[model samples]
Target: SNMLLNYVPVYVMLPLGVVNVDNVFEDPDGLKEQLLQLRAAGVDGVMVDVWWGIIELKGPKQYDWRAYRSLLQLVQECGLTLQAIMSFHQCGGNVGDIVNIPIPQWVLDIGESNHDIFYTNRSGTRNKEYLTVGVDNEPIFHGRTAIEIYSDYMKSFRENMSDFLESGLIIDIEVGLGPAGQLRYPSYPQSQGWEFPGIGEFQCYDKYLKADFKAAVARAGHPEWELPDDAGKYNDVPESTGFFKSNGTYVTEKGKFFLTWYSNKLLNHGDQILDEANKAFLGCKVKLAIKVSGIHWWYKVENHAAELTAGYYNLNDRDGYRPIARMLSRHHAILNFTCLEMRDSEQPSDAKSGPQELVQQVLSGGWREDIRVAGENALPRYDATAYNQIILNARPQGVNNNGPPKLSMFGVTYLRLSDDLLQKSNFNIFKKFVLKMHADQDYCANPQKYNHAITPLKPSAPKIPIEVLLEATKPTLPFPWLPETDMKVDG
Candidate 1:
C-alpha cells in the first residue's frame, strides 16, 4: 500500500500543430485559440513538443528559439501549464506524421552514414527516425558527444525561457529516447524484418556497439563472447540465456550482471541529459519524466533471448526493472507508461499481470515514497471506459476508492482542440475524469474531515501452480538459436 501525497495533475497531449515549426510562426492566433479551448476543459496542463530538429535546424550550436519562445509565452498567457517535451529524436514516420522533423542535417553529416548511426536488425535494415545513443562515438561527430550537444541546447533554451519556467507554469519535462518518444530500442518499421513478439527485437550491432559489447562481455568474465563477423549471429551464442529465466528472474547471478551493465548505460544516458537540463533550470519547479513501453515482451521468455531482449524496459517484473524505477525515483522523475492496457491482452496469455507489482515494489522498497506514477491511452482503441479502468486499476489499493485516485495523472494522447477524436463520446468522459481528478486533489489538500489513514500493503507473490513454476525454471537457449518454424514477418 502507498500513502497519499499531494493531488495529481492531469495533462493532455497538445503537439505543436501539424508542420509544428511552420504553424507556430505562421498562425500564432490559431494556436492561442486552441490553447483557450483546452484551458476551458479544466485540463491542468498541455503537453507540447519543443523539437530539437526545428530549433537547431541550421547547425550545431546555432538555434532559432523565436517561434518556441513565443509559443511558451502564448501558453503562459492562456493560463494553462505546459509539459514541455524536449524531443531530441526525429519526428516524422511516427504514428502520425505530417512533416519530417529530422535531426539537424549538419549533425547527421557527422556520422559515417545515416544507417550507421541509427539502430539495425538481423536483416541489416535501419530505422531512420532517430539515431541510437548508447554506442555513438563522438570523434566522428566533430569530437562533440550527443550528450554534450543536448546539454548545450538546453543551456540555450533555459536562458531564453527563464521567465516562463521560473513562473512555475512549466510543470514537467518529458524526455524523449526512442521512436514516438518512449524508452526502448527501434521496435518499428516492420520492413526491418523482425518477427512480431520475437525476432523483431532490435539489437545494437553497429561498429561502435560491437566494440562496446566485446568490452562488456570481457568484463563480465566471458572473454570468449566475441562479436561474430556475421554480426546477425550476435545473440545466438549460448551466453544470451544468462540474462533471464523463463520465470522472469532478472536477478540471477548472470542476469543481474548483464541487467545492471546494460540498464545502467541507458539510465546513465538519461541521467546525464536530465542532469544537464536540471542544471539549466536550477531553481525552476519542473519534474523530469521519461516514456516507457507497456508490457514486458519477455514474460514469455521461450520466444526471446533473456539477456539480449527488450524485457528490460517492462515494469511488470521488479527483478529486471527495479533498478530503473529506483534510478528515476532518485532523480525525482516520473516513470510514465504508454499503452498500459496491453498488459491485459488475451492474445498474450502470459502478460495478464499489469504493472501493479511494479508499483508495489517501488512503494515498499522506500525507493522514493514520493515517486509519482502516470499513464496514457497509447492504444488505438482510446475508449473512455477502457482509459478510466486503467486509471482506476493503476491506483494504489490502500487509498479510499470513493475519493479521487492516488495515481499521478492520466493523459489523452494527441489531444488537439480541433481533432475529430474529440467528437467521440469517450473524450467527454475523459473531460469529466479530468475534473474528478482535480476535485480529488482539491479535497485531499483541504480535507474537511479526517479520512482513514492508509497503511502500505506489501505485494504478494504469484498465484500460479507449483508445477508451472517448476517448468519455468528449465534452462533455455536464445529463441533465435532454437529450431525455426512459422516465425516470419507478416506479409
Candidate 2:
C-alpha cells in the first residue's frame, strides 16, 4: 500500500462559473443537489473560472457579490471547495462581450492616445498604413507607464475576494494569455507603467542596463564594441552583433540570469495582487491561499521558429525552463506547468521523457528551494504510473497535486457513451521460454541492474481464470465491449 505525504482528495471538472454563473443562483436547490452528487461521488473541489467583469463590470469602485452570493453559499453548505480562476484578461470565452472579461475598464483604457503603439487589425494581408485600435478598444499601455494603477486595481479585487479565503475558495491569480506567451504579461506602455512605477526598470534598453553593459565592457577583457562618444546615435549598431555575442567572462548562463530577475519581478507583482486581495478577508476571519498558473501559453518553445529557439534560449542562456520556473516559485505560488500536449514521437506511446529529466535536474539544482511539480502535456492519461515515475524519481520534492487534469475517480457521470460504437485493439502476452535460459544469465533480483528483458509481474497465488480477470478489470477502460454480443453463438 502507498501513502501520500500530503493528502489531497480528488477534484472534479465542472461547467464551472463561466457557463453557469449567470443562472446558478436561480436554481439553488438544483445547484445544491448537483454539488451533493459530486461530493457523494468523491469530488473534493470544483475548478471554476470566476470572471470579475461578469460580476463587477463597471470598475473596481463598485462590487456586487449578489451575483454569486447564493451559489457560493450552496457550495459551502455542500462541503465543496472552489478553485476560483480569476480571469483578469479573458479574451477566449466562447461567447460574450469582451468588456466583461474581468479586467477593469479603467485598466483597459490605458494608452489610448498613441495609436501607433496599438496592434493593427488588417482587412487586407499587409497593413500599409500600420494603423489600428487598442486591444478591445482598451488603450495599449506601452512602456512601464501604468504600473501603480494596474497594481491598485488588482489589489482592490484581491481585497474584495476576502470572503473566499477561509470559505473553501482560494482566490487564484489568473493572468490572461499575451503576445509573448507570458503570464508575466505584456510590457505594453500601460502594463509596464502599472507594474513598474518609475517606467524605466524594463523598457527598450533602459539606462541602467545600458550603463551596466557599457561599464562591464569598459572594465572587462573584451573590447569588441567601441562605446559611442555621441549621447544617442547609431554608434552602437555596428557593435550590436558583438554585444549579442556570448561574452566568455560573464557567461551566457549568468548574463541570461537577468531573464529570471525580470521574470520574478512580474511574478512578485502578481503575488502582490493576490496578497492585497487576501488581506481583505482578514476581518471576516478567512484565510485563503493564492497560487499562480505555472504554464504560460505564450512562454513555451512553440512561439518562435525551431531555429530561433536555441538562439533565443542561448541569448538568455537558459538551457532549460527550470531556472525560469524557480524564480516564479519564489513568489509563493503553485504552477500548472502545462505539458499536457508533450508526447514522445519516436515511441508514440511513451511520454516525452526530456521533461522528466528536466524536472529532476531542476529539483536537484534547487534542492533548498520550495517548489511543486506538475506534468504538462501528458498528465493523467499518460498513465498515473508514468507521472508517478517522475514523482518517485524526483522523490519527495517534485510536485503538488493542485495542478493539471483535476482527476476524479468518483466524479458524477456527466457523459454517457455506448461501448458498442467504439473501435478496439488486442494485446497479446507470451510466457514462452527456452530450456537453456537460466536466471543468472538473463535476470537478477534487482531488475534495475540487469540488461535483459524482465518478465511481467504475475499472480502470487494460483492464476485466476482469464475470463474472471477480464470481467473484473475490463470496465476500467473507457470502452469495454461485451463479449456476449460478439462471440460466435453455438446453436
Candidate 3:
C-alpha cells in the first residue's frame, strides 16, 4: 500500500503552458509562427487539444493523426515541450467556445438515433458534447464501449507520439473525462441556459443512468428509492430549489443516498478511464492529468448547490474535492483545477461565490492527498492583478516573496492562444508572467534530446476569423430555461 504521492518534495517550480487556439492547426504555418513567438517569449510548453472529433472523425477505429502529426512536429521544431489534451468532448457550445470542434460525427449520429446515448436531463434534453456516464461500460458505440473507445484513443495517441514520448518532448497527457475536459457532470452547461450562479438540475434521467441508479439503490436494500424529483432546472438559484435550499433534501438521508450514488458513478467512470489510460501509456515517462471544474459559485451555502449539481457531494461543512483527489492519487495523476484568476471581491456577494476560497480548498485538498496540483484560469483575464493572483495561487509559499520557491502547483496553463493574446500589450505581460513563473528554474524549451532545443522568430498570427461564430453548435431545444416536472423546485 506504500505508493507514490506519500512524500512531499521540499522544492517545486511551476512551468507555464499556453493552450493553442482551437483551430491553430487549420493554418499550420500561421500556428508555426505563433509557436515560435511563444517560444521566444519564454513559454516552457504549450497544450494542444487532440480532438477526438478530428482524430477519429470518420468512424470507429478510423484514426487519423495527419494534422496532429504536423502540429506536434511544428511545436517540437519551435523548441517547446508539449502537453496534449485528449479532448473527447465537443468543443462548441461551452463558455469561451469561439471554435466548433464536434465530437466524432458518428457518435453524434448514434445519439440522434438513440438520444439515451447522450447525457439526458429531467426535461428529456440530451447534451451531445459528451456521452452519458451510464454508457461507460455499455457497448453502445458500434460494439465499442465508451471506456474501450477512450482507451483505444489514448493507445493510438501513444503509438503516434511514441518518438516524442521517448524523447521527453511530450511530457503530459490531460484526459478529458467530461464537459470541458473536466471530471464532472455537465450540470450547468451554458448551452442549456445555465448561467453563472445557477444551481443546475440533476442529469441522471437517461435510461441507462436511471437503470444504474435503480441497481445501486436495490443493492443498498432500498429498491423503492428513486432519483430526486425536486432538484430544480438549469437556471434556478439555490434558494429556488428544493434540493439546494437551506434545510432542503440535500442534507437529508435520501439526498445523501442519491448524491452518493450519483457521484460514485462519476468516480468509478474516472477510475476506469484512468486505469485504461495508465495501461495505454504504460512505461512512458509522461504524467497523466485530469481537469476538475471549480464550481465556486454557491460555495458558501450550506449545500454548495453548483458543486452538487456538478456531481461533487460537498457542503459548507465538508471537503468534496478531497475524495476526488484521493481517486486521482490512486493513478498518480495531476489534478488540474480552474478558477484561479478570480478574486473574492469580484464575485457576486448574494450568490456566495468564492473563487479564491474554492481555489485554496481544492488545491490544498490535492496537496493533502499527496498528489500534484495544476492550475488554470477559468475566464480570460490579461490584467496584472489576475496574473498576480494566479502567481500567488500557483506558488502559494512564495506569496510573501520570502520562501525558497516552494510551490502548490506543478504548472499553470494560460487559458488559450489567440491574436488578442498575442497583442503586444498582453503578450509583454504574459512573457513577464512566464518568466516569473519559471523563476530561477533554467528552461530548456526543447527537453527532447539525443539531447535537445531553437530559434523562435516573431508573433505573426493572423487574426482568428470571427465568422466561425456561425458554426458554434448549440442544443436544438427551443427553450432551456423552463422548469421540468415542476414540483415546487424553489423553496
TM-score of each: 0.74, 0.47, 0.85
**Tens-digit lDDT track of model 1 for 17-129:** 43365434666777777667667666666787778778887777888888877777787888777778777777666555555777777767655464567666555666666
lDDT of 2 at 225: 35
Report the candidate with higher lDDT, 1 versus 3. Answer: 3
Per-residue lDDT tens digits for candidate 3, residues 1-491, read: 11111111111111111222232345666777887788777777778678888788878999877667776777789877777888889877878777677788889888888889888888889899998898998898899999999999999989988888887777678999998888889898889887877888788899999998898889888899888888888877878777777788988888888987787777778878988888888878788889999888888777888888898877655556777777777677889888877887888887788887788778777776678888788888878777777766766654223433333477788877777778998988876576555542334343332121211212212322222211211112111111111111111
For model 1, the local distance difference test gives: 0.52
Show where candidate 3 strays beyond 4 Å.
1-24, 399-406, 440-491
Question: How far in Å is the alpha carbon of 145 misplaced in model 3?
Answer: 0.6
User: Model 2 — which ten-residue stretch has the worst lDDT?
Assistant: 426-435
Between candidates 2 and 3, name the one with more favorable TM-score: 3
Highest lDDT scorer? 3
* Per-residue lDDT of model 2, residues 65-128, tens digit only: 5656565666777776654444444333222222223244444454233433232211111111
* Residue runs of model 1 more than 4 Å from their true location after superposition: 1-6, 16-26, 112-115, 135-137, 188-199, 227-260, 296-308, 311-318, 341-370, 380-382, 398-418, 439-491
Total backbone clashes of candidate 1, pairs 3 or more residues apart or in separate chains: 4
TM-score of 1: 0.74
